[PDB]
Write a protein that binds this ligand. Structure first.
Ligand code: D8P
Length: 330
């Protein structure tokens, strides 16, 4: 089997991407944030505290004839930015772009933190990291990908995120029309439960390539590119007036600037992030200070190849018994 679904930026800055997902019988369609940095499929639901729902589409398990309470199971998750959610668990039928999983754990939110409430366009998250990170207790549950894997033509999914435009998540096949040149594959470590790999280095603009190992994770659920302070300082040093602001919480730059590209290494291959991809606009409405799309990972504990990096590539998440990651230009 295979599946193919379009993913769409939630706003004009590509702060996140939502993908339609069918849950239950008859189908209830929710727009989920596909997140290769976590492993929980959770949704706003009829069980979510009323004051914490503001515009989201909710899942109502009582209206699904295939919904079954997973008796005794609870879940509780906190993400890298301090946001969180928790609740109980149903199993139900879940379909993504024509690909159907029966008995998928659908984690029903009883509580969500403010940043989720304030995000009316995101109805939930669909985790695509390794199932070892799934927070369901006392019986850990499998991701949508993990459950579909054996049925897929090939044990892979691909992320093809658009810049200020829709993109595609495919399951079970590699669309050879979706990229240019060849796909370069690189080793993955699952030891932290992430799609963790090692970049071979970087370049700023038309500058020379610096060979240096940068361990990081491919995370569709993170907006920006977070890299070591050395690398990030080298980038912003090429933008006149750019500076790190503690009050704003990262590098900002004059909105009148033209940003340089940023290149990262994948083995001997190179992925080029155009400068415009690194512009996240005025820090506040009407401001002439703009927020940068490349930031320091120093306060995180891990480097994160988020959407800013990933949207510049066609990315293969290969879930064979020895997982690997593939990157192609497009
Ligand atoms: C993957 C994920 C986790 C938590 C959150 C999230 N995404 N949202 C939608 C955005 C992402 O920039 C930030 C707000 N914190 C909640």
């Amino acid at each position: 089997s295979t599946g193919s679904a379009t993913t769409t930026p939630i706003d004009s800055l590509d702060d996140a991407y939502i993908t339609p997902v069918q849950i239950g019988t008859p189908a209830q369609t929710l727009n989920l944030d596909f997140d290769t940095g976590s492993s929980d499929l959770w949704v706003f639901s009829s069980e979510t505290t009323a004051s914490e729902v503001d515009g989201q589409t909710i899942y109502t398990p009582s209206k699904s004839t295939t919904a079954k309470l997973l008796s005794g199971a609870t879940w509780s998750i906190s993400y890298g930015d301090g946001s969180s959610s928790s609740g109980d668990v149903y199993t139900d039928t879940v379909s993504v772009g024509g690909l159907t999983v029966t008995g998928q754990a659908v984690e029903s939110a009883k509580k969500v933190s403010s940043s989720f409430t304030e995000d009316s366009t995101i109805d939930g998250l669909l985790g695509l990291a390794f199932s070892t990170l799934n927070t369901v207790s006392p019986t850990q549950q499998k991701t949508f990908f993990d459950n579909a894997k054996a049925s897929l033509d090939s044990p892979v999914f691909t992320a093809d995120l658009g810049y200020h435009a829709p993109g595609t998540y495919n399951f079970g096949f590699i669309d050879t029309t979706a990229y240019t040149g060849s796909i370069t594959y690189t080793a993955v470590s699952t030891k932290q439960g992430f799609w963790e790999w090692t970049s071979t280095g970087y370049a700023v603009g038309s500058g020379t390539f610096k060979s240096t190992s940068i361990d990081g994770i491919a995370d569709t659920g993170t907006t920006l590119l977070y890299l070591p302070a050395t690398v990030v300082s080298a980038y912003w040093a090429q933008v006149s007036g750019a500076k790190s602001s503690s009050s704003v919480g990262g590098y900002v730059f004059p909105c009148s600037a033209t940003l340089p590209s940023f290149t990262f290494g994948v083995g001997s291959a190179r992925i080029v992030i155009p400068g415009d991809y690194i512009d996240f606009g005025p820090i506040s409405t009407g401001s002439s200070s703009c927020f940068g799309g490349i930031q320091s990972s120093a306060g995180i504990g891990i480097n994160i190849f988020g959407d800013v990096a990933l949207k510049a590539a066609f990315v293969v998440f290969n879930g064979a018994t020895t997982p690997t990651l593939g990157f192609a230009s497009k």
